Amino acid sequence: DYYV
Amino acid sequence: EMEKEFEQIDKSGSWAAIYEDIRHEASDFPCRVAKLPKNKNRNRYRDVSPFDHSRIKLHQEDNDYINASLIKMEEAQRSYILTQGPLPNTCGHFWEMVWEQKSRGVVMLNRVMEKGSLKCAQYWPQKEEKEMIFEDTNLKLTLISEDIKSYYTVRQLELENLTTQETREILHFHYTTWPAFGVPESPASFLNFLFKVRESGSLSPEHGPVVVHCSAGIGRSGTFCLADTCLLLMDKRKDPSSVDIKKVLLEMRKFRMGLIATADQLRFSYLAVIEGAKFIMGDSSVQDQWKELSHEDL
């Protein structure tokens, strides 16, 4: 649930 | 002719070099409301938040927060709202935003499922007879008709305000073949889609800003709004060569973090703005070449  | 700065970078091969420079120079404003705990479940990603200064506010007395940003391009004279793919609990907020901001179009650039990852809730009705009712925000949403194509679909929706019983038509433009962290199949595919949006009237200034979203609302969404804005400036200034794509992107990043997510998306932005300038230069018939070249029928 992180973008990067 | 900014085709120079392009061939220079491709031969030089320094696209990632240039992409990383924008990350370093890009603005950095507080995201305080986004980070409150009562809003942890209204954000899809924990490293993607709207700046306090440009965030959209719901006209709610309890919690007015949604992960969306108003991108007001002052010179180009167009505003956009970039938001994340709605969450199971934020669908009502999404359409409340659409209503309160008077938007007329929604541009969706992801799919609900992407490489096995759930990137977005199913926030619009797929069947005419199965309409959605968002009780938290008092809105009703009904599929009226749809126009399917090779790589995109345009839907006509009716959004009703259950309180005032007022109704509005919303155009949903769904790009179905744009991979996360990827690029469109060809500049023609993209520009045919963009001009389909332009021609529909959803971008006119008598309407609220168009809502643009993908998964996080920064990567594919950023590519879309960057190309449209550069073509607007190209035409406003009345000079293709004047538009500095890197500078326009950094202006957009004052309003939402992270716009454009890879070096390849940035290169496609150049490619798309370069192709589209043909139309702005006066070759109005290139548009029909894009339609034929995009295989939009099948």
Residue numbers in the entry:
A (entry chain D): 1160 to 1163
B (entry chain A): 2 to 299
Copy text from the publication:
Protein Tyrosine Phosphatase 1B (PTP1B) is the prototypical protein tyrosine phosphatase and plays an essential role in the regulation of several kinase-driven signalling pathways. Here we identify PTP1B as an inhibitor of IL-6 and show that, in vitro, it can dephosphorylate all four members of the JAK family. Dephosphorylation of substrate is initiated by nucleophilic attack by the active-site cysteine (Cys215) to form a phosphoenzyme intermediate followed by hydrolysis of the cysteinyl-phosphate to release free phosphate. Asp181 acts as both a proton donor, enabling protonation of the tyrosyl leaving group, and as a proton acceptor, receiving a proton from the water molecule that hydrolyzes the phosphoenzyme intermediate.
To determine the substrate-bound form of the D181A/Q262A double mutant we used the bisphosphorylated activation loop sequence of all four members of the JAK family as substrate peptides. Incorporation of the D181A/Q262A mutations leads to a five order-of-magnitude reduction in catalytic activity compared to WT PTP1B20. Nevertheless, in multiple co-substrate structures of this mutant, we observed that both steps of the reaction had occurred; dephosphorylation of the pTyr, presumably via the usual cysteinyl phosphate intermediate, as well as hydrolysis of that cysteinyl-phosphate. Surprisingly, the products of the phosphatase reaction (both the phosphate and the tyrosyl-peptide) were clearly visible in the active site in all four structures. The phosphate was not present as a cysteinyl-phosphate intermediate nor as the pTyr substrate but rather as free phosphate. This suggests that dephosphorylation had occurred within the crystal, as well as subsequent hydrolysis of the phosphoenzyme intermediate, but that neither the phosphate nor the tyrosyl-peptide product had completely diffused out of the active site. Accommodating both of these species within the active site necessitates a reorientation of both the tyrosine (back and across, towards solvent) and the phosphate (towards Q266, where it has displaced the water molecule W1 that Q266 coordinates) compared to previous structures. The occupancy of the phosphate was refined as ~60% suggesting that a proportion of it had left the active site but that the majority still remained. Our structure suggests that incorporation of the D181A/Q262A mutations have corrupted the usual catalytic cycle in which substrate is released prior to hydrolysis of the cysteine phosphate. In some of the JAK activation loop structures with the D181A/Q262A double mutant the register of the peptide in the active site is possibly scrambled, with populations of both the first and second tyrosines being present in the active site.
